[PDB]
Amino acid sequence: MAHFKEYQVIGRRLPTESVPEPKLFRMRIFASNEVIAKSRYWYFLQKLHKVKKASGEIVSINQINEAHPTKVKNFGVWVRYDSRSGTHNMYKEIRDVSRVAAVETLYQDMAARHRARFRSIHILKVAEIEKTADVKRQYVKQFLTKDLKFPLPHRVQKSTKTFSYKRPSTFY
Amino acid sequence: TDSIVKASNWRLVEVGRVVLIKKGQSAGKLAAIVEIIDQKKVLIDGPKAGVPRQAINLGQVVLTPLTFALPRGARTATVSKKWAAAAVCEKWAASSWAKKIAQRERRAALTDFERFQVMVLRKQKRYTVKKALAKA
Amino acid sequence: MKYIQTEQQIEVPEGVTVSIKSRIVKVVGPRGTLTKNLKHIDVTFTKVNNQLIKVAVHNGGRKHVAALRTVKSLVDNMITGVTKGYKYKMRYVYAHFPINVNIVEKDGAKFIEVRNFLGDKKIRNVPVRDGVTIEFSTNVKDEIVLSGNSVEDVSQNAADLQQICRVRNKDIRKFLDGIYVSHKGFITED
Amino acid sequence: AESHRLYVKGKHLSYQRSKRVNNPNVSLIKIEGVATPQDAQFYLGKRIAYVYRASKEVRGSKIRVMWGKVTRTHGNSGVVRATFRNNLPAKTFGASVRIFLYPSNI
Amino acid sequence: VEPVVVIDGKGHLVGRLASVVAKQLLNGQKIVVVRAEELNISGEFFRNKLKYHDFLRKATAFNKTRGPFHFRAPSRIFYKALRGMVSHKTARGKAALERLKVFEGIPPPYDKKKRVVVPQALRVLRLKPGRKYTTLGKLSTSVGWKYEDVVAKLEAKRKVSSAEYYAKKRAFTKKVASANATAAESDVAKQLAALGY
RNA sequence: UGCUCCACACAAUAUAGAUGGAUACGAAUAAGGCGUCCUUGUGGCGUCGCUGAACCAUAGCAGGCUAGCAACGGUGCACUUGGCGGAAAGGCCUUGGGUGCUUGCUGGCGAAUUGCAAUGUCAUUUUGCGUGGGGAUAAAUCAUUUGUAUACGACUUAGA
Ligand SMILES: [Mg+2]
Ligand SMILES: [Mg+2]
Ligand SMILES: [Mg+2]
Ligand SMILES: [Mg+2]
Ligand SMILES: [Mg+2]
Ligand SMILES: [Mg+2]
Numbered sequence A: 001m002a003h004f005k006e007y008q009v010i011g012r013r014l015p016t017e018s019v020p021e022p023k024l025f026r027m028r029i030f031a032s033n034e035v036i037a038k039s040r041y042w043y044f045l046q047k048l049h050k051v052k053k054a055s056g057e058i059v060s061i062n063q064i065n066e067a068h069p070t071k072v073k074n075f076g077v078w079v080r081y082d083s084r085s086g087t088h089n090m091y092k093e094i095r096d097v098s099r100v101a102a103v104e105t106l107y108q109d110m111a112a113r114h115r116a117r118f119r120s121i122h123i124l125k126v127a128e129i130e131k132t133a134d135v136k137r138q139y140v141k142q143f144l145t146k147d148l149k150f151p152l153p154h155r156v157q158k159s160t161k162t163f164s165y166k167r168p169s170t171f172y
Numbered sequence B: 001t002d003s004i005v006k007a008s009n010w011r012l013v014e015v016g017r018v019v020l021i022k023k024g025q026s027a028g029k030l031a032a033i034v035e036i037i038d039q040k041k042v043l044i045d046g047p048k049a050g051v052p053r054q055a056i057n058l059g060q061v062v063l064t065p066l067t068f069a070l071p072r073g074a075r076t077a078t079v080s081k082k083w084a085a086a087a088v089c090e091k092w093a094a095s096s097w098a099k100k101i102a103q104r105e106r107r108a109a110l111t112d113f114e115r116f117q118v119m120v121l122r123k124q125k126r127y128t129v130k131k132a133l134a135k136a
Numbered sequence C: 001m002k003y004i005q006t007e008q009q010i011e012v013p014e015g016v017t018v019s020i021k022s023r024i025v026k027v028v029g030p031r032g033t034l035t036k037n038l039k040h041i042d043v044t045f046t047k048v049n050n051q052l053i054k055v056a057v058h059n060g061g062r063k064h065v066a067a068l069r070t071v072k073s074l075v076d077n078m079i080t081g082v083t084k085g086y087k088y089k090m091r092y093v094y095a096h097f098p099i100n101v102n103i104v105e106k107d108g109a110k111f112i113e114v115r116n117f118l119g120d121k122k123i124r125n126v127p128v129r130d131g132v133t134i135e136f137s138t139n140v141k142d143e144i145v146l147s148g149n150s151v152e153d154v155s156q157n158a159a160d161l162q163q164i165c166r167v168r169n170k171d172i173r174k175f176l177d178g179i180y181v182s183h184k185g186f187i188t189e190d
Numbered sequence D: 001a002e003s004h005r006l007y008v009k010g011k012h013l014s015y016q017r018s019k020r021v022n023n024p025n026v027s028l029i030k031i032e033g034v035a036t037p038q039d040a041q042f043y044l045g046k047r048i049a050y051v052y053r054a055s056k057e058v059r060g061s062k063i064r065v066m067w068g069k070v071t072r073t074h075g076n077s078g079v080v081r082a083t084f085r086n087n088l089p090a091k092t093f094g095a096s097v098r099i100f101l102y103p104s105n106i
Numbered sequence E: 001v002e003p004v005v006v007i008d009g010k011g012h013l014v015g016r017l018a019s020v021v022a023k024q025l026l027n028g029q030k031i032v033v034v035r036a037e038e039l040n041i042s043g044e045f046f047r048n049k050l051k052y053h054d055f056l057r058k059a060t061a062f063n064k065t066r067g068p069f070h071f072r073a074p075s076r077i078f079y080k081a082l083r084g085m086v087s088h089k090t091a092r093g094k095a096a097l098e099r100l101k102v103f104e105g106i107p108p109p110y111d112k113k114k115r116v117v118v119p120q121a122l123r124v125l126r127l128k129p130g131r132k133y134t135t136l137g138k139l140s141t142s143v144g145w146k147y148e149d150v151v152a153k154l155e156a157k158r159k160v161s162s163a164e165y166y167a168k169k170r171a172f173t174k175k176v177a178s179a180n181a182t183a184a185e186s187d188v189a190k191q192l193a194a195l196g197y
Numbered sequence F: 001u002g003c004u005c006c007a008c009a010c011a012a013u014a015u016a017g018a019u020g021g022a023u024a025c026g027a028a029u030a031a032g033g034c035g036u037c038c039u040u041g042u043g044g045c046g047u048c049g050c051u052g053a054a055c056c057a058u059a060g061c062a063g064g065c066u067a068g069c070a071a072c073g074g075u076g077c078a079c080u081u082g083g084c085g086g087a088a089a090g091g092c093c094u095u096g097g098g099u100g101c102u103u104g105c106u107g108g109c110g111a112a113u114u115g116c117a118a119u120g121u122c123a124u125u126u127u128g129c130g131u132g133g134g135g136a137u138a139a140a141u142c143a144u145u146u147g148u149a150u151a152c153g154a155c156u157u158a159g160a
Helices: A034-046 A100-114 A138-144 B076-086 B088-094 B096-108 B112-135 C062-083 C151-164 E015-024 E045-056 E074-082 E091-097 E136-142 E147-181 E187-193
Strands: A003-012 A025-031 A057-065 A072-080 A087-096 A121-128 B017-021 B028-038 B039-048 B051-057 B061-067 C002-013 C017-020 C024-029 C032-036 C044-047 C052-060 C086-093 C101-106 C109-116 C124-127 C135-136 C143-148 C179-186 D008-017 D022-031 D047-053 D065-075 D080-083 D095-102 E003-006 E029-035 E040-042 E100-102 E133-135
Touching: A003 A034, A003 A100, A025 A034, A025 A100, A034 A057, A057 C062, A072 A100, A087 A100, A087 A138, A100 A121, B017 B039, B028 B051, B028 B076, B028 B088, B039 E015, B061 B088, B112 E147, B112 E187, C002 C062, C024 C062, C032 C062, C052 C062, C052 D022, C062 C151, C086 C151, C109 C151, C124 C151, C143 C151, C151 C179, D008 D047, D022 D065, D022 D095, D047 D080, D095 E187, E003 E015, E015 E029, E015 E040, E015 E074, E040 E136, E045 E133, E045 E136, E074 E100, E074 E136, E133 E136, E136 E147
Parallel strands: E003 E029, E029 E100
Antiparallel strands: A003 A025, A003 A057, A072 A087, A072 A121, B017 B028, B017 B061, B028 B039, B039 B051, C002 C052, C017 C024, C024 C032, C044 C052, C086 C143, C086 C179, C101 C109, C109 C124, C135 C143, D008 D022, D008 D095, D022 D080, D047 D065, D047 D095, D065 D080, E040 E133
C-alpha cells in the first residue's frame, strides 16, 4: 500500500420479479486496492440497508483521481472511531495536495494520538475548505499566514561511512 | 557602545527557495518551493531540469542559499518563466557547491589513461609548488 | 502543538549595550556588567534597531515556548538590574527576644550574623554574596536592605537570611520570629 | 611503484547462520568499499583467496591459499556470500581476504 | 582503512558508540578510544546515577569479591557497555576485546594521532534538542572515580601544547595554500582543472 | 670459558591476519572554520561546508643499466647541532655538510619460454647457533640460628 486509493463503488440489490432495476447505491471508499474497496462497500451497506454480498451485486468500481493533484488544499475530515470504552465523533483538519494522502495522514494521526486502528475508524466525510478563515484548527491555521517562512535549525546530515574526520556542524 | 548580536544566518523554507533533490528519480536536480504544506512537506517544481510538480518531504531535499521572487502557488509555466528571469541555473553553476559536484562527477568519469595523465601533471605542478615554497 | 514561530521582544535603553555570544548574554549599563549563560534553552537572538532585541523559538512545543518567555524575563531582569538595580528590604520580626543582626568579617568573607534569635546561643552566619551590599537603615526600626545589580543574587541572599531564622520544634503560626522580605524594588527608583 | 595490489581487500565476517546454527559451507565477506547489493553485484563470481602462512614449507613456500569465489550478495549493506573449495577455518572471522578482479567482464 | 582507528569519545552516546566499536572489533579493526570521561549518556544525571547505584547493590551475597565488579572509571564504564555487546567468554570475543583500548583523556602516543568521530553515535546528531544528558566524568566521580582532577589538569596541558602545534600547522597551511593558488592559472593547472583536479 | 649488549650469517619458531600513508587544534552545534583589515572585540568584511567522493602519495627488471637538459627544489640514508616532550614521556621539531635517487624535461639499451591463471613467496615475532666488537665480575635457597612469628609451610633475626 504505497498509498490509499479512492474508489467509487456502485452496487444494488439483486433484481427480482417484484423489483427489477433496484436503486443503485454508491459510496466513495478509501482502500488499498479493489478487493478491499468492494469489501468496505458491502461492510458499510450492511449498516444502512437490508442487503449483504449474497443478496447484492457490485455494478461498478472506478478509481477517483484528484482533480488537481498539484494544488495544496486544506481538508476538513469528519471521522467516527471506537476507542477502548466507546464510540466518538471528531473533526480534524489536514493540509495536503490530495484527498487520498490526507486520509492516509488521518489514519496515521488516529493511530498515533488515539491508538485507533483502521479496524476502528469510519471516514464520515472529507471535504476541502474552499475559503480561508473557515479553517479552525490552529495547527493548520498557522500555515496560512502571509509570506510564511521558517528555518530548519539543527540540520543532521546522514553519514554513509562509520567514521568521520571532521567533527561535523549542524548549520543550515 | 552598541549592541552586538550574532545573526546566525539560516536558509529559510519559503516560496521561491531553491532546493537540490538528493533522494529519488531527480536526485541532484534543482527545484523551487511553490507552497509550504506543513512543517515537513513542501510543494516543489523543477521545470527547467524536469522535476515534476510534487509534494516532497523536506528531509529528502537540501535547501540552497539561492532564492528568487515567485508568487505562492505559481503554476509550472510561471515557475519556469521566473526561474529563467532570475537565472537560477547560472547562479547555481557559479557556486563552489555546484563546482564541487561537477568536480566529483568529472573525477569519477576519468579513464585509466586520464588518471595516469593526472598523476604526471600533479607531479609537475608539485615540482613548481615545492620550488616556490623553498624560495618563499 | 508545534507553533512555527514564537516571538519575544527585549527592549534595551539608551545607556545599555547588550552583547550576545552563542548564548552567553552580557549586559553593560550605568551600574556595571552582568553575564548570563543561556546555552540550555535553544533560542535565537537577533538585534533589530539597537533599542530592540528579538528572541525567538522555531518549531517549538509548549515547554519550549514557555522557556522563551522565561528567557525574555531573565534578560529583562539583567537590564533592569544594571540600570535601576534591585533593592530587597527585610524586617526583623520577634516577640520577646530582640534579634541582633550585624555585618562581620573573617579573612575577608563578609558574613551577616544573627544573634539572640529566640534567645538561641547559636550564632547564625549567612555569607554575603559578591555584588550584594548590606545596609541597616535609619528612620525605621529593625530592617535590613540588600542591594545589587543581580536580582538572582540579591534575592537568594535575602532568601538565605530568611531561611536561616526558621523556627524549629514550635507552632510556627504562634512563633513568628524571623527576618522576612518586606519589599522588593529597585535602587535607583524615584 | 609503491603499491602492487591487483585485488580488493575484504574481511571474513562469519559463516552463513541463523540465531543458533551456522553453516561453514558458506562464508560472509565484507568487500572494502562496497556498501549496497548493487555495488556488490559487480564482484559476483570473482575469485577470493585467503592467504595465510604456515611454519612448514610444502612446495617451495611457507605461504598457502584457500581459493573460493563470490556467489551472491547478502543483506542490504554490500556484504557478499563466498564459497571456498575448502571451508574457511572460523578462526579467520575478522581476517583479511583478497577479492581478485578476475574473471573480468569490465 | 586505517590499521588503528582512534575515536575521540567526547560528545558520543555511550551505548551507540559501544555497539559501533563492538562491531568494529569483531570485524577485525583495532580501535583506541580516547577522552572516555567526555562520553555522554542520554538522560538526566540523577537517572544515570540512580541506575549505577542499582548496579552497585548487586553482588555475590556470600563473597563480594567473586561478584559483579563495579568499575568506576569512565573508560571502564564504556568497556562494560562494550562487553555484553561482545561474546566475551569465547576465544573470538577475547581476540575482539584485545583489539580495543579505552583511555581517559588522550595519553601518548595518541596525542599526535588523528582522532575520528562516529557521527552515527554523536549526541549532537542523535539526541533531540532539549533532551537532558549525562557526562560520564561527573557520573564516574559521583560513584567513586578518583582521578577527574588529574585528568582535567593533564588535558589542559595537552590542549595548550596542541593549540601551539595547530598555530604552526595553520601558518604552514597558509603558505602552502598561497603557493598552490599562485601556481593556479598556469598551463599545468589548467590541464589539471580540465580533469577535475 | 660462563653472562650481557651490539653488528652480521645460518637455522628453527610462530602469526586473531602488512599488502601506498593511523593524515594530531580547541571549542560550539539555535553555531562554526578559514582569510583579511582595524578602533584587538561576544569586532567589520569576505569566504567555506551540504562529507574522506578528501589530502598526500603514486610511472621505472616488486621497479634494471646508461647519456644529457633545466632547477638548487624534493626525498632516502647514516654522521651531526640544538631544543622540546613524564599520562603510558621512548616521540616531535630542528641545524650542518656528506653520500644516493629523483618521473621536473629529453634520450639509448634490457625484459620474452613463469609458456592462457595458480599468494606465486617481498612482512614482523620469538628462540637458538656461529663469527667479531664493547661491557660487568652476584646472589638466593637448604642446612645452622632468633622468637617481635608460628599447626606445617610461611614470617622475623643472626652467622667467614
Ligand atoms: Mg511542643
Ligand atoms: Mg562470526
Ligand atoms: Mg547468514
Ligand atoms: Mg559473580
Ligand atoms: Mg584530532
Ligand atoms: Mg573503594
